[PDB]
Scaffold this active site. Sequence first.
Site, PDB file in Angstrom:
ATOM      1  N   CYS A   2      70.994  31.652  53.787  1.00 25.89           N
ATOM      2  CA  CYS A   2      71.854  31.305  54.906  1.00 25.89           C
ATOM      3  C   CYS A   2      71.066  30.543  55.970  1.00 25.89           C
ATOM      4  O   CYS A   2      69.889  30.831  56.198  1.00 25.89           O
ATOM      5  CB  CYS A   2      72.466  32.565  55.516  1.00 25.89           C
ATOM      6  SG  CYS A   2      73.562  32.260  56.917  1.00 25.89           S
ATOM      7  N   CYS A   4      71.077  33.664  59.247  1.00 28.40           N
ATOM      8  CA  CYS A   4      70.235  34.847  59.134  1.00 28.40           C
ATOM      9  C   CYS A   4      69.230  34.761  57.994  1.00 28.40           C
ATOM     10  O   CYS A   4      68.448  35.698  57.804  1.00 28.40           O
ATOM     11  CB  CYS A   4      71.107  36.096  58.969  1.00 28.40           C
ATOM     12  SG  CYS A   4      71.900  36.256  57.356  1.00 28.40           S
ATOM     13  N   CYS A  48      78.058  34.230  52.825  1.00 28.21           N
ATOM     14  CA  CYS A  48      76.851  34.932  53.238  1.00 28.21           C
ATOM     15  C   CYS A  48      77.213  36.357  53.629  1.00 28.21           C
ATOM     16  O   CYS A  48      77.956  36.570  54.592  1.00 28.21           O
ATOM     17  CB  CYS A  48      76.177  34.217  54.407  1.00 28.21           C
ATOM     18  SG  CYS A  48      74.651  34.992  54.990  1.00 28.21           S
ATOM     19  N   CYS A  93      76.319  38.031  57.591  1.00 24.41           N
ATOM     20  CA  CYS A  93      76.515  37.064  58.660  1.00 24.41           C
ATOM     21  C   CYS A  93      77.782  36.265  58.404  1.00 24.41           C
ATOM     22  O   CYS A  93      78.140  36.015  57.247  1.00 24.41           O
ATOM     23  CB  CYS A  93      75.312  36.113  58.785  1.00 24.41           C
ATOM     24  SG  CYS A  93      75.205  34.849  57.500  1.00 24.41           S
ATOM     25  N   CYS A 153      29.052  35.918  -9.543  1.00 24.99           N
ATOM     26  CA  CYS A 153      28.884  34.670  -8.816  1.00 24.99           C
ATOM     27  C   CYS A 153      27.466  34.594  -8.269  1.00 24.99           C
ATOM     28  O   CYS A 153      26.868  35.610  -7.910  1.00 24.99           O
ATOM     29  CB  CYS A 153      29.897  34.545  -7.667  1.00 24.99           C
ATOM     30  SG  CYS A 153      29.648  35.726  -6.317  1.00 24.99           S
ATOM     31  N   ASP A 196      17.984  56.981  18.067  1.00 20.82           N
ATOM     32  CA  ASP A 196      16.737  57.253  17.300  1.00 20.82           C
ATOM     33  C   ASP A 196      16.764  56.439  16.002  1.00 20.82           C
ATOM     34  O   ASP A 196      15.684  56.006  15.557  1.00 20.82           O
ATOM     35  CB  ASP A 196      16.524  58.748  17.044  1.00 20.82           C
ATOM     36  CG  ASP A 196      17.629  59.414  16.245  1.00 20.82           C
ATOM     37  OD1 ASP A 196      18.664  58.764  16.029  1.00 20.82           O
ATOM     38  OD2 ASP A 196      17.443  60.580  15.847  1.00 20.82           O
ATOM     39  N   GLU A 197      17.953  56.239  15.427  1.00 18.72           N
ATOM     40  CA  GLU A 197      18.086  55.423  14.190  1.00 18.72           C
ATOM     41  C   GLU A 197      18.025  53.936  14.558  1.00 18.72           C
ATOM     42  O   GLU A 197      18.181  53.616  15.751  1.00 18.72           O
ATOM     43  CB  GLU A 197      19.396  55.771  13.480  1.00 18.72           C
ATOM     44  CG  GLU A 197      19.685  57.259  13.445  1.00 18.72           C
ATOM     45  CD  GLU A 197      19.246  57.957  12.170  1.00 18.72           C
ATOM     46  OE1 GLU A 197      19.878  58.968  11.803  1.00 18.72           O
ATOM     47  OE2 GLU A 197      18.273  57.489  11.545  1.00 18.72           O
ATOM     48  N   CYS A 222      29.682  38.112   1.236  1.00 16.49           N
ATOM     49  CA  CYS A 222      29.242  37.016   0.382  1.00 16.49           C
ATOM     50  C   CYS A 222      30.179  35.820   0.507  1.00 16.49           C
ATOM     51  O   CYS A 222      31.404  35.968   0.535  1.00 16.49           O
ATOM     52  CB  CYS A 222      29.173  37.475  -1.074  1.00 16.49           C
ATOM     53  SG  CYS A 222      28.428  36.279  -2.207  1.00 16.49           S
ATOM     54  N   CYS A 246      32.016  34.902  -3.301  1.00 16.72           N
ATOM     55  CA  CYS A 246      33.107  35.706  -3.828  1.00 16.72           C
ATOM     56  C   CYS A 246      33.958  36.378  -2.762  1.00 16.72           C
ATOM     57  O   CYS A 246      35.085  36.783  -3.068  1.00 16.72           O
ATOM     58  CB  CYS A 246      32.568  36.792  -4.774  1.00 16.72           C
ATOM     59  SG  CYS A 246      31.143  37.700  -4.131  1.00 16.72           S
TER      60      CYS A 246
HETATM   61 MG   LIG Z   1      17.888  60.136  13.923  1.00  8.82          MG
HETATM   62 ZN   LIG Z   2      73.112  34.469  56.618  1.00  9.55          ZN
HETATM   63 ZN   LIG Z   3      28.998  36.894  -4.390  1.00 11.31          ZN
END
Ligand SMILES: [Mg+2]
Ligand SMILES: [Zn+2]
Ligand SMILES: [Zn+2]
Lengths: 110, 146, 146, 215, 49, 83
Positions: free
Chosen positions: A5, A8, A26, A29, A75, A91-92, A100, A103
Site C-alpha cells: 500500500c 500504510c 488494502c 487501511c 590379468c 600404536d598400530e 587393480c 580387473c
Molecule cells: Mg596395538
Molecule cells: Zn495500506
Molecule cells: Zn588385476
Amino acid sequence: MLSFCPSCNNMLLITSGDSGVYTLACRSCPYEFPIEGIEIYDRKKLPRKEVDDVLGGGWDNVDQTKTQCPNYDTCGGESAYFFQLQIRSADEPMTTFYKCVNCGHRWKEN
Amino acid sequence: VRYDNSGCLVKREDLNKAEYVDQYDAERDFYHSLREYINGKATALANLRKSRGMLGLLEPPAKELQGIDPDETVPDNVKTSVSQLYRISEKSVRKFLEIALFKYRKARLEPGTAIGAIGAQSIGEPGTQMTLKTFHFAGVASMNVT
Amino acid sequence: LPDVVVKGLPDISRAVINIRDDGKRELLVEGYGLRDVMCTDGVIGSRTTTNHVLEVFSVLGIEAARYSIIREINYTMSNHGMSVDPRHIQLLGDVMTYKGEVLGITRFGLSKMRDSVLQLASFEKTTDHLFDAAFYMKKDAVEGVS
Amino acid sequence: MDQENERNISRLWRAFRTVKEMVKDRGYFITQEEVELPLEDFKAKYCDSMGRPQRKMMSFQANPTEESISKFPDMGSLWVEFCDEPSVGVKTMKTFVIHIQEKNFQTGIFVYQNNITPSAMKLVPSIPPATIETFNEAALVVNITHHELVPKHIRLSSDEKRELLKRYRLKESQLPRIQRADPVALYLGLKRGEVVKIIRKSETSGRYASYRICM
Amino acid sequence: VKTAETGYMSRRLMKSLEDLSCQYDNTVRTSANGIVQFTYGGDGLDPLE
Amino acid sequence: EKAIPKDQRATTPYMTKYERARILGTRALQISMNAPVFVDLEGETDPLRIAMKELAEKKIPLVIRRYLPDGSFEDWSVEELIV
Ligand SMILES: [Mg+2]
Ligand SMILES: [Zn+2]
Ligand SMILES: [Zn+2]
C-alpha cells in the site's frame, strides 16, 4: 503478487468487490486500487535445467601405485588406485587400500 | 543316476533337460571337469606327437594292424624327443585321479557342523574392518552409493 | 505450480547415463520404481536390476530377492578386499528368504518362526516378549543353542 | 493425440504376449504362432479401423496339452478375459463369474485396466468349482520369468510332491515356503500346498535345484 | 568407530544363524528341523576344504 | 525310533571331526573312571592320551548313533568308521 500500500505499506491483497471486480484492496487501511481493464501480471523466470552428458569415469585423476593384485593369474595388473587410512589404533601403523586397474579387484594390504 | 521328479529313469535324451537337475549334479560336473583336464593333457601330448610327424593317437585305433605299436616306423629319435617333452605314465594318471577324488570327498561338508554360526562369523568379522563412513578413491566422482 | 510432474516417472530422483568402460551407454536411476523402469519403452526388462532387495522381492519374487541379497552382499565385500566364500553369503540369503518373504535380522524379523522366547529375550526386548509368551501361554520347546 | 494411442497399442500388444507366454508355460495349447505376434499384426487383427485398441475379441480359450493333462489329470480349460473400464465394478465381475459357471471353466484370468474395486475381495473368492486370477495390464507388461534374476520355477504334480517328501523324509511344514500372491507364484497359478521345483544357478556351485511349497 | 562397532554385525547375524547346522542327510536345517538348504551351497562342500 | 539296518546306511562312512572329538572325550572320561583299556600304555597316565592311542589302534569300544532328521538312526561302530 507482492504489492504494498502507498498509505500504510502493508501488503496488498486482491479482494472480490461488487460485480466481481478484482481490486487491489488494502487491509488495515482505506486504500483501493481497482482494475479498469488493466492487466496486473507477475512474471518470474525459471531455470532451463539443460541436458547432462554421460557420467563416464574420472579414474585418471586418482593416485595409482606399483603393486600386483592377487588376481595376477587372470590379468597382468601392476597398478592400483589407492588411499591410505589409519583405521588401526595409534600404536598400530596405517592401512592402505587398493584397486587393480586391470580387473577392478580391490584389496587392503594393511 | 538322475531319476525323474517321480523317481523314474531319464530317457538319455532329456538328461540335461533342466527339470531333472538335482543333487549329485555338482559331482557330475566335477567328474566332467576331471575328464576335461585329462583330455587337455592328452591333447597336448597328441599335438606334440603329430607336430613331430608321427601319429597323434588321440582317438583309439581300429584296423587289422591295431595290435601293432604305431611307433615302430619312427627311428628312435622323435620317440625319445617326445618322451623327453611329455611323458605321462599310467601311474601318474591314476595318482592324479586318486588325489583329486580324495580331495573332493574330503571337501564335503561334515554333518553336525555349526555352518550357520561359521557363516555368521565369516560375514561379520569382515564387517569390523570396514568404515561406517563411505571412503572413495580421490577422483572417482561417481554417485555416492553406500 | 512449478513443482508438478509433467514427464517422467514419479519415483525417480534423477536418471544418469553411465558407460561400462565400453561403447555401451547404460542409464542407472536413483529412484524407487523398478517395475516402471522395466515397463518403460526403450529399456530391456529382461536385464534391469535394482539394488533394493525389498523392491526386487515385491516385483520379481522371493527367488530373485535371494539372488539380489547374495549379489548385493558379494558386491559389498568384493569392493573391500573381503575374501568371503560365497557359500556363507548363499546361506545368509537362504536363511533370510526361506520363510517365503525377505525377513531381516532385526527384532521384528527374528519373530519369524522361532517361538523361542528365551532366545528372543537374550537377543533383545526381553520383558515384552516374556509377558507376551506368558499371556498367550506359549509352549516353546528347548531346541535353540541359546 | 497419437503418441498416447500408439504407446497404448504397443503396451497392450506386449501384455497380450506376456499372457500368451504365461498360459503356454502354465501348460496349455498355445504355440509360437499366437505367441510371437508382431505389433503390426496385433493392429491388423485386434485393432478396429478407428484404431482404438478393443479388449473383447482377443479374449480366447486355452485348452490343456496332452503332456499337461497327463501330468495333472484335473485341469480344465482357461478363459482369459480383458476388462475395458479403468475401475471394474460388481456388475462386470458378476457377469464374468456367470460366464465361468455357464461354460464350466476351471479357471478364468481377469486382466483389468487401471484398478480393482475394493468390493471385489468379497466377491471373487466365491466360486467352488473354479478360481479367478486377477491381473493388471501394467503388472504384466514384461513377464518376470524372462528376467535374468528369476530362476526357472517348475511346478510339481501331486505324485512328484509325494516323491519329493519321501526321498527327503519330510513334512510340508519343513519345506521352504513361497508366498501366495508371490510374483512368480501368481504367474504359474500356484495354490496352497503346491510344490515348485526351483532350478537356480550359482557361480561357484553350478546348476542345482531347490524346492518351495506354496502356503 | 571400528572399536565401538566391533561385535554388532557378528552378534546380529549370530542371533539369526545360531541354530543352522548340517544334518546327516546333507541338509541345512533350523533347530525346528525345517529345511533352509536341501544341500549346503547347492554343492555340499565345506569352504574350509 | 526305527534303526536303519546295517546292510544299508545312507550317512557318510567317514568319522567326522565332531564324532572323533566326542569319542575321544567319552573314552577318556571312561578311562578316568577307571575303565579297562585295550592298548599298551608304555607309561602313559593321561586318559586323553590313552584314548588317542586306543583310537589309533582302532580299539575304542563305542558305536556312533547318527540320528537322521526324520527321527530314525543308524549305528556306526568306531572301528568301521574310517579316518
Ligand atoms: Mg596395538
Ligand atoms: Zn495500506
Ligand atoms: Zn588385476
